[PDB]
């Protein structure tokens, strides 16, 4: 299957409060690195290259 290769885009801005979490703008895209451990996914920003956690309800599949 093709589950892991789905890319996601932020629907909303988010401002992180800890160094391990990513800040992002609406419209920025992500590769998801780990999504098996709750509401927060580990992700790679396709805009900045930074990796960290993001609140998964802020993002949606790109298409």
Swiss-Prot record:
Phosphorylated at tyrosine residues, which can be enhanced by NTN1. It comes from the Eukaryota. Isoform 1 is highly expressed in the brain. Isoform 2 is expressed in cells of hemopoietic lineages, especially T-lymphocytes. Transmembrane segments: none annotated. It is found in: Cytoplasm; Nucleus; Cell membrane; Perikaryon. Residues 3-63 form the SH3 domain. Belongs to the protein kinase superfamily. Tyr protein kinase family. SRC subfamily. Non-receptor tyrosine-protein kinase that plays a role in many biological processes including regulation of cell growth and survival, cell adhesion, integrin-mediated signaling, cytoskeletal remodeling, cell motility, immune response and axon guidance. Inactive FYN is phosphorylated on its C-terminal tail within the catalytic domain. Following activation by PKA, the protein subsequently associates with PTK2/FAK1, allowing PTK2/FAK1 phosphorylation, activation and targeting to focal adhesions. Interacts (via its SH3 domain) with PIK3R1 and PRMT8. Interacts with FYB1, PAG1, and SH2D1A. Interacts with CD79A (tyrosine-phosphorylated form); the interaction increases FYN activity. Interacts (via SH2 domain) with CSF1R (tyrosine phosphorylated). Interacts with TOM1L1 (phosphorylated form). Interacts with KDR (tyrosine phosphorylated). Interacts (via SH3 domain) with KLHL2 (via N-terminus). Interacts with SH2D1A and SLAMF1. Interacts with ITCH; the interaction phosphorylates ITCH and negatively regulates its activity. Interacts with FASLG. Interacts with RUNX3. Interacts with KIT. (Microbial infection) Interacts (via its SH3 domain) with hepatitis E virus/HEV protein ORF3. This is Tyrosine-protein kinase Fyn. The gene is FYN.
């Amino acid at each position: 299957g093709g589950t892991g290769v789905t890319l996601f885009v932020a629907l909303y801005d988010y401002e992180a409060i800890t160094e391990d979490d990513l800040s992002f703008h609406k419209g920025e895209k992500f590769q998801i690195l780990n999504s098996s451990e709750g509401d927060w996914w580990e992700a790679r920003s396709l805009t900045t290259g930074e990796t960290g956690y993001i609140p998964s309800n802020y993002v949606a599949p790109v298409d």
